[PDB]
Design a binder for this molecule. Structure first.
Ligand SMILES: *[C@@H]1O[C@H](CO[C@H]2O[C@@H](C)[C@@H](O)[C@@H](O)[C@@H]2O)[C@@H](O[C@@H]2O[C@H](CO)[C@@H](O)[C@H](O)[C@H]2NC(C)=O)[C@H](O)[C@H]1NC(C)=O
Ligand SMILES: *[C@@H]1O[C@H](CO[C@H]2O[C@@H](C)[C@@H](O)[C@@H](O)[C@@H]2O)[C@@H](O[C@@H]2O[C@H](CO)[C@@H](O)[C@H](O)[C@H]2NC(C)=O)[C@H](O)[C@H]1NC(C)=O
Ligand SMILES: *[C@@H]1O[C@H](CO[C@H]2O[C@@H](C)[C@@H](O)[C@@H](O)[C@@H]2O)[C@@H](O[C@@H]2O[C@H](CO)[C@@H](O)[C@H](O)[C@H]2NC(C)=O)[C@H](O)[C@H]1NC(C)=O
Ligand SMILES: *[C@@H]1O[C@H](CO[C@H]2O[C@@H](C)[C@@H](O)[C@@H](O)[C@@H]2O)[C@@H](O[C@@H]2O[C@H](CO)[C@@H](O)[C@H](O)[C@H]2NC(C)=O)[C@H](O)[C@H]1NC(C)=O
Ligand SMILES: *[C@@H]1O[C@H](CO[C@H]2O[C@@H](C)[C@@H](O)[C@@H](O)[C@@H]2O)[C@@H](O)[C@H](O)[C@H]1NC(C)=O
Ligand SMILES: *[C@@H]1O[C@H](CO[C@H]2O[C@@H](C)[C@@H](O)[C@@H](O)[C@@H]2O)[C@@H](O)[C@H](O)[C@H]1NC(C)=O
Ligand SMILES: *[C@@H]1O[C@H](CO)[C@@H](O)[C@H](O)[C@H]1NC(C)=O
Ligand SMILES: *[C@@H]1O[C@H](CO)[C@@H](O)[C@H](O)[C@H]1NC(C)=O
Ligand SMILES: *[C@@H]1O[C@H](CO)[C@@H](O)[C@H](O)[C@H]1NC(C)=O
Ligand SMILES: *[C@@H]1O[C@H](CO)[C@@H](O)[C@H](O)[C@H]1NC(C)=O
Ligand SMILES: *[C@@H]1O[C@H](CO)[C@@H](O)[C@H](O)[C@H]1NC(C)=O
Ligand SMILES: *[C@@H]1O[C@H](CO)[C@@H](O)[C@H](O)[C@H]1NC(C)=O
Ligand SMILES: *[P@@](=O)(NCC)OCC
Ligand SMILES: [Cl-]
Ligand SMILES: [Cl-]
Ligand SMILES: [Cl-]
Ligand SMILES: [Cl-]
Ligand SMILES: [Cl-]
Ligand SMILES: [Cl-]
Ligand code: NA
Ligand code: NA
Lengths: 527, 176, 352
């Protein structure tokens, strides 16, 4: 019987056999007051305290969210859908600790992506038991509110302040500061890691004064707050709050009344209207996301980044070779997961119309010009590849590279990777390559499980990444020091060195996407 | 190895096997076939050209190093032999510029670029292609050891070609 | 000492650990142990460091050896807390008598029960701590003796005796490696022979006898202390390295064994300062100087002898790798001790 005494009560965990050893998992510990009723849309409130033993023996409810129904029956997409019941009562976290209980383990805290609209910590690809077993770190993951219920904003109005989901994450980080010693963890050695929106979230905890003392280091996989989808302007946020009112018949004149009205709607009526608070959207829409609320985020965060106003610490940042392909089967003409998607010049152009709603005609001609200079006009998959690169470069790769440059210019070690391995088990077709989201299973060590049908070269790749991430977390340096590995150089402005992660030879290279990002980063923001 | 290293003590040959048969991992059936190629190519051509280039450049002169990785679309030899000795020559002399000849378009463009780089080297001492937003070819120095890869897709600046292999051939093997 | 030494007139804020051989390895692990960080100021490591191949036992070997000792004391069990309970009833003597056997093959340098990564004193493989700079930031003084390896040869290498000059043959040399490198593939051992038997020239009869000593000393003590010192100093701290090359005038071991492991210790502790003791005058002066250098290191972080026109001891850095030789005639500043030998042990051999 493993019972641990926490500040709010006792909790019982469960033992798991992993690789001929044991990990103790405490699945579903509450960390805030359930955000129901009067508390809907408000910042998360303190947990009250219980006697008797909370049983943390299974995953808790996932927060309310729309689900991806585009490919029913299909693992490729269904693997991301929630796998526990949805409920507004979803503010729980998970702890995995190695056995025997460590003395002062470094802690890895995972923040999931999902566009700020979806996600849950109980997905199988975020299962922290391999890490705990293999590297003897503690892994913590938390559910936080998404969609309107997590990010609705009526600027400065405490009934709907914005950023409630980011404050859920923060209160979870606080829970670890207060409680992880009791599980054998070191609150002084905490690394946040996250993918996509979860990485953007990590990058904003780097800017948030309230998070500064709740963690040590930060890993950002495929995401950063300067990505064009990651932060909602105050203008758009009001327009969207009022639009959702209108659609739920909650338009009012007193704004605290709109919110009161909205707090009587059924979760389902809020969810069903989220998609429409915007006239046009895209496969990458983030209708309700972080805002500058004057609380979690004290100023436009592009200004914080430029002027060096963030937590001074080491970061590890990376992206995948084909970030953009996943999104193309969700609305670009001629694209299908069920064929090779050779599209034409005219389809390409339509595709841009899908990904760049407006975006002036000049804006879109300029993308076509930059991305359709073939060498040469012969290859039939030219346009299909260009559209992927367009989406991936704009939305993930150039922004992560620009965050990394700007962050490192203030003095801190930063390490950048380019992940170029396509899973042998990827259910999506070949033409989509090394997709967004598919490094995550390597990071969490699933390929270390031999029963699972990953190749041997994949076991070795994952083993190495798991060690690099753990060394980063414990020591601030993502080296693998024991197996004559390529040494990972820090990323600086000027040389811009990065490490490629693949099953054959990892290489040191420089200036990833130099020409592409000069376009996205210097010019396009102008159109 | 017995064929390529007549003698060459038994220790000499064990040391090659040791250096070249540390698989990642022992799974791939073409492991040994690839290792033997690399052995022969690294000892006989690649590590020596890299060591000549380092030593020559240490006296002050600009030196430029390439790694040619394009396999001719018309190569009559089988696939497993890859980008063979001797088969850059047709690119250098510009045969692929002749359209009647059945080379691909990406091969015409590759040869056109190499022909210009070699001619600029000859006329001006600098193998740049200055007009078509080309990757600029950095001089090779001891220390960084930058080189340019020549291929139909993207040419890249990389560093320290065959570092571990040539440490073996260059520092140790001459001793056995 | 932290709690009590003030009462005896000592300064808990000025504590230097010093140790030799395994005691030095221990010093080097207190540098890595979070629990020791505030219990001392500076560290001296004579002939030893944790990265020596004998100094840390892997978790694999440690279990194999615990169970093997159970088996030999008839304490095999299934509940492991029962093995231990059983073992706690054995008589000290039954435990001691079986220690030698928990291992199939061993050598004159075996460490059957030694430090392990326990997740407590030692939180990770300490080679990783060292490489990644995770240790106490302070000055270190590190050194080794000219013939570290000879002492061990009379404990099992064929043809070696403390009672003659031990001229051995090529075939004995090869057998000797078999004694010191249990396995160690045949290639592994050919590579040692290759590196150490390139004579200049094949004439000298004591060639092989000297090579075997150097092999043992370079692998086990000298190259590891030099690699610890480089890696430690790369994080910014002053480090000082010595090469001790004085053979005691009273050494009871034969001449061919030279400046043996362990025999600097009497100089450090100042025995030669006692005139009644039959050490030479040049030995009194040598010990007096070392005692002052070690005390200055301890008090001030700098092993200088400032008063008698002494050679100044330069810090050891990566790149130049300067060290001071300690001997009765002239102490010298030199560079890159055993450069070629340690390139072999340090870069290549860990691979075989
Ligand atoms: C700010 O929101 C308005 C609101 O318009 C929306 O009404 C919502 C309930 C929702 O159903 C949504 O789909 C609908 O568009 C946006 O105004 C609309 O803009 C579009 C395109 O410009 C026009 O065709 C509509 O006529 C117009 N409707 C109204 C009522 O004015 C407005 O565009 C938005 N701000 C931006 C720039 O996105
Ligand atoms: C690859 O498939 C796309 C996706 O759309 C189609 O998916 C197919 C597998 C098939 O079941 C078809 O019924 C389904 O609609 C094809 O795009 C479609 O192209 C056809 C041209 O005949 C148009 O009629 C559709 O508008 C268009 N679909 C949409 C709405 O995007 C695509 O042509 C196909 N490409 C190939 C085989 O190269
Ligand atoms: C892990 O320990 C086993 C145990 O073998 C030992 O039994 C002990 C009680 C002790 O007396 C010891 O001398 C004896 O060897 C080792 O297995 C042995 O390995 C040797 C050499 O490979 C074999 O010849 C023995 O047959 C074999 N014995 C058994 C019972 O299996 C094992 O080698 C060791 N691990 C290593 C690699 O050192
Ligand atoms: C130096 O002595 C070694 C050590 O062994 C011997 O020690 C001698 C002093 C003597 O008492 C002898 O009885 C004792 O065994 C000698 O090694 C020995 O060499 C002889 C060759 O005649 C062998 O019979 C032994 O196996 C071997 N001893 C072992 C087990 O190591 C050595 O030959 C001698 N060398 C000289 C004098 O140069
Ligand atoms: C656990 O270690 C604590 C400090 O160790 C950390 O120091 C931090 C500043 C940071 O660099 C971490 O990565 C280090 O690991 C120490 O103060 C505590 O007393 C320890 N707690 C225990 C062992 O109970
Ligand atoms: C004894 O000296 C104490 C401090 O002296 C030491 O400062 C340390 C940081 C370290 O550098 C040592 O080597 C220095 O010698 C002082 O604080 C105490 O008060 C002193 N105690 C006495 C004299 O009673
Ligand atoms: C917690 O789990 C244990 C299972 O042994 C059980 O005894 C106890 O009743 C549980 N508490 C609940 C389900 O409220
Ligand atoms: C709006 O209604 C709120 C909620 O009761 C009330 O507190 C406030 O007085 C109203 N605001 C004004 C003055 O318009
Ligand atoms: C080191 O390599 C060995 C094989 O020699 C392998 O078993 C292990 O996975 C490696 N360790 C790490 C951290 O990759
Ligand atoms: C420059 O590129 C053009 C196409 O824009 C091409 O026709 C020509 O081959 C190039 N010149 C060189 C030297 O490669
Ligand atoms: C092993 O025996 C110990 C000592 O009494 C006991 O505490 C423990 O329950 C046993 N372990 C198990 C459950 O196998
Ligand atoms: C300094 O040299 C004198 C002789 O001039 C000697 O007596 C004394 O031992 C020396 N002091 C030290 C610290 O060596
Ligand atoms: P990330 O969370 N970014 C999307 C806007 O990836 C999942 C969609
Ligand atoms: Cl083409
Ligand atoms: Cl690129
Ligand atoms: Cl393999
Ligand atoms: Cl290479
Ligand atoms: Cl000679
Ligand atoms: Cl030397
Ligand atoms: Na333009
Ligand atoms: Na060798």
């Amino acid at each position: 019987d493993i019972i641990i005494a926490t500040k709010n009560g006792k909790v019982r965990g469960m033992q798991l056999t992993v690789f001929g050893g044991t990990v103790t998992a405490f699945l579903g510990i509450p960390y805030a007051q359930p955000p129901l009723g009067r508390l809907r849309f408000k910042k998360p409130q303190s947990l009250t305290k219980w006697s008797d033993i909370w049983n943390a023996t299974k995953y808790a409810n996932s927060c309310c969210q729309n689900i991806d129904q585009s490919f029913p029956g299909f693992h490729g997409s269904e693997m991301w859908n929630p796998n526990t019941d949805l409920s507004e009562d979803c503010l729980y976290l998970n702890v995995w600790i190695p056995a025997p209980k460590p003395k002062n383990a470094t802690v890895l805290i995972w923040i999931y992506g999902g566009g700020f609209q979806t996600g849950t910590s109980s997905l199988h690809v975020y299962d922290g038991k391999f890490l705990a077993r293999v590297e003897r770190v503690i892994v913590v993951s938390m559910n936080y509110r998404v969609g309107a219920l997590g990010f609705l904003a009526l600027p400065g109005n405490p009934e709907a302040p914005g950023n409630m989901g980011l404050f859920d994450q923060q209160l979870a980080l606080q829970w670890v500061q207060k409680n992880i010693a009791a599980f054998g963890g070191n609150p002084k050695s905490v690394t946040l890691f996250g993918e996509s929106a979860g990485a953007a979230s990590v990058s904003l905890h780097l800017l948030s004064p309230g998070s500064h003392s709740l963690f040590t280091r930060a890993i950002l996989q495929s995401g950063s707050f300067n990505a064009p989808w990651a932060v909602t302007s105050l203008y758009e946020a009001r327009n969207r709050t009022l639009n959702l009112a209108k659609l739920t018949g909650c338009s009012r004149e007193n704004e605290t009344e709109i919110i009161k009205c909205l707090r009587n709607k059924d979760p389902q009526e809020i969810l069903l209207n989220e998609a429409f608070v915007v006239p046009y959207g895209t496969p990458l829409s983030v209708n309700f996301g972080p805002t500058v609320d004057g609380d979690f985020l004290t100023d436009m965060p592009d200004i914080l980044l430029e002027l060096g106003q963030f937590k001074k610490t080491q970061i590890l940042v990376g992206v995948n070779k084909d970030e953009g392909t996943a999104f193309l089967v969700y609305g670009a003409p001629g694209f299908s997961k069920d064929n090779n998607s050779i599209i034409t010049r005219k389809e390409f152009q339509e595709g841009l119309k899908i990904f760049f709603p407006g975006v002036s005609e000049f804006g879109k001609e300029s993308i076509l010009f930059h991305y359709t200079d073939w060498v040469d006009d012969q290859r039939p998959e030219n346009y299909r590849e260009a559209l992927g690169d367009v989406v991936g470069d704009y939305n993930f790769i150039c922004p992560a590279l620009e965050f990394t440059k700007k962050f490192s210019e203030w003095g801190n070690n930063a390490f950048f990777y380019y992940f170029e391995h396509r899973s042998s088990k990827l259910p999506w077709p070949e033409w989509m390559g090394v997709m967004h989201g598919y490094e995550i299973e390597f990071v969490f060590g699933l390929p270390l499980e031999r029963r699972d049908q990953y190749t041997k070269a994949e076991e070795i790749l994952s083993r190495s990444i798991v060690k690099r991430w753990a060394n980063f977390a414990k020591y601030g340096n993502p080296q693998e020091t024991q197996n004559n590995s390529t040494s990972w150089p820090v990323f600086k402005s000027t040389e811009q060195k990065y490490l490629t992660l693949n099953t054959e030879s990892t290489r040191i290279m420089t200036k990833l996407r130099a020409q592409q990002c000069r376009f996205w980063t210097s010019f396009f923001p102008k159109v």
